[PDB]
Amino acid sequence: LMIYKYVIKNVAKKYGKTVTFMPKPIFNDNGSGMHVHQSLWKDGQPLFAGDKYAGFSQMGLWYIGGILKHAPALLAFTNPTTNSYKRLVPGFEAPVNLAYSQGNRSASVRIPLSGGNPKAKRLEFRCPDATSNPYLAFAAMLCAGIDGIKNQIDPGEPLDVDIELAKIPSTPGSLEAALEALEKDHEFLTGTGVFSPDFVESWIEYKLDNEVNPMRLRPHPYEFSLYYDC
Amino acid sequence: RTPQEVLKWIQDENIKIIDLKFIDTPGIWQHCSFYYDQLDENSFTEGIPFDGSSIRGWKAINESDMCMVPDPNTATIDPFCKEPTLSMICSIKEPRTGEWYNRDPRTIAAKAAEYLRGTGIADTVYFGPEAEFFLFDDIRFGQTENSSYYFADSVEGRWNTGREEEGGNLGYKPGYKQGYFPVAPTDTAQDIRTEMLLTMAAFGVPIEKHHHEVASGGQNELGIKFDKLVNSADN
Ligand SMILES: Nc1ncnc2c1ncn2[C@@H]1O[C@H](COP(=O)(O)OP(=O)(O)NP(=O)(O)O)[C@@H](O)[C@H]1O
Ligand SMILES: [Mn+2]
Numbered sequence: 465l466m467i468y469k470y471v472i473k474n475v476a477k478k479y480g481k482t483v484t485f486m487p488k489p490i491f492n493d494n495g496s497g498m499h500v501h502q503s504l505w506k507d508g509q510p511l512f513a514g515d516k517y518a519g520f521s522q523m524g525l526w527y528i529g530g531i532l533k534h535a536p537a538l539l540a541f542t543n544p545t546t547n548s549y550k551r552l553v554p555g556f557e558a559p560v561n562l563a564y565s566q567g568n569r570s571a572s573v574r575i576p577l578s579g580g581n582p583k584a585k586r587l588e589f590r591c592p593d594a595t596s597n598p599y600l601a602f603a604a605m606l607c608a609g610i611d612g613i614k615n616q617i618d619p620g621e622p623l624d625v626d627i628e629l630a631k632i633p634s635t636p637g638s639l640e641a642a643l644e645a646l647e648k649d650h651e652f653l654t655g656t657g658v659f660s661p662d663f664v665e666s667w668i669e670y671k672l673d674n675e676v677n678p679m680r681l682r683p684h685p686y687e688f689s690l691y692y693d694c
Numbered sequence: 695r696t697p698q699e700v701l702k703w704i705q706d707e708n709i710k711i712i713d714l715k716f717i718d719t720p721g722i723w724q725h726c727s728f729y730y731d732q733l734d735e736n737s738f739t740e741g742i743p744f745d746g747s748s749i750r751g752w753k754a755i756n757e758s759d760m761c762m763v764p765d766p767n768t769a770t771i772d773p774f775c776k777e778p779t780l781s782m783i784c785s786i787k788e789p790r791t792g793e794w795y796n797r798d799p800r801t802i803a804a805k806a807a808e809y810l811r812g813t814g815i816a817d818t819v820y821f822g823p824e825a826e827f828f829l830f831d832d833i834r835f836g837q838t839e840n841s842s843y844y845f846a847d848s849v850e851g852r853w854n855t856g857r858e859e860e861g862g863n864l865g866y867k868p869g870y871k872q873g874y875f876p877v878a879p880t881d882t883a884q885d886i887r888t889e890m891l892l893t894m895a896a897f898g899v900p901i902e903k904h905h906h907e908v909a910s911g912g913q914n915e916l917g918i919k920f921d922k923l924v925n926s927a928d929n
């Protein structure tokens with residue numbers, strides 16, 4: 465992913481153009497997301513292939529369980545910017561709703577339709593964007609996945625619909641909210657040894673002091689549109 | 695007022711020009727100005743000639759000649775004339791027959807009120823129109839073979855919140871659908887609407903109120919009292 469981002473930016477510069485991986489640079493148009501497909505394997509065999517929902521295995525359902533349960537905390541690593549929350553807005557275009565489904569591109573976790581191939585059986589976590597550190601985002605999603613199989617988190621029932629909506633758990637609406645969810649739920653990362661409690665604390669502190677707090681201080685131009693006359 | 699009272703008015707006040715106004719078929723006011731001596735008692739019956747073939751939806755070139763018959767009750771001073779000018783609203787007479795012209799909208803209007811009185815249902819119909827308008831600072835339109843365009847502009851226009859203005863951009867541009875009816879500096883048309891309201895009052899119009907309308911970029915409305923059919927369409 466780091467190479468991917470490097471060549472794209474540098475070929476753009478070569479042709480006198482400029483690239484951004486920011487989630488929402490354009491208002492009233494599609495955001496830039498980083499959908500991340502994942503699957504566990506042992507002895508060359510796909511472990512997410514089975515006879516349960518959407519041709520998945522119970523382990524695969526459990527991995528989704530963890531992802532969905534730890535998703536608000538996961539967002540402090542997978543969507544770590546204030547701008548991330550301009551894309552993760554209810555309506556345009558989702559995935560704001562914490563549920564799994566097959567084929568449904570409005571759900572947080574999507575099970576793509578594989579051509580009856582066990583090797584192509586995986587989950588698509590749609591929430592992430594390309595502002596994330598792929599090393600941190602991937603390690604975090606793995607940890608939530610493993611905890612899901614080990615605990616053995618029921619992901620609930622699939623939601624095979626477009627757009628009552630309060631019955632379904634939702635993702636954080638801001639960066640501080642995702643940082644709050646990380647303080648409350650970080651044992652699936654730390655207790656493992658992968659992320660140190662030192663790192664998890666410095667992450668929250670860096671994001672609050674350098675992004676959340678500087679943003680709260682700055683007047684937004686749309687505040688003139690709404691408030692100049694008052 | 696009577697034909698003689700209007701003629702006495704012109705003599706006493708030394709009014710040199712008379713502006714006779716009349717509507718065309720689509721709805722546009724037409725006019726012709728005359729030196730005072732051209733208007734006599736007979737102008738109020740026989741009427742004053744003009745070309746009925748240059749007015750949209752009327753006579754054909756071969757049967758052109760028509761007559762303008764002014765209404766004495768409409769006489770007032772037109773404030774828009776530097777030279778003190780008396781203005782009257784006309785109805786159109788057919789010189790061939792001597793009867794009121796069947797395509798004259800003002801004749802049709804009188805006929806409608808005559809019909810109401812004929813049925814015994816009522817003697818009077820009161821009409822109260824409420825005509826909203828836009829007050830623009832600029833208008834550019836056209837359409838050629840390779841183009842079609844219109845560009846409407848106003849200082850109140852919300853589309854102008856980020857523009858450089860001469861000394862400078864003072865804000866308070868009403869938002870779309872948000873013009874009814876915040877105070878000044880949002881409403882920039884208070885003084886003008888009062889002037890529009892007061893000058894038409896002096897023209898003989900029964901006036902009531904005025905306000906800024908819903909739309910951003912100059913939508914306005916002036917409120918006038920009801921009147922009888924012809925009087926209301928004259929108003
Ligand atoms: N009995 C009546 N017959 C005919 N017209 C009337 C009558 N009474 C009032 N009007 C007129 O109808 C017009 C209505 O203005 P207004 O009093 O503001 O009513 P309105 O419905 O609140 N106006 P608006 O809010 O823009 O729809 C005025 O010209 C009144 O004089
Ligand atoms: Mn995708």
Ligand SMILES: [Mn+2]
Pocket residue numbers: 824826907915
């Ligand atoms: Mn109105």
Ligand SMILES: [Mn+2]
Pocket residue numbers: 824917
């Ligand atoms: Mn009104």
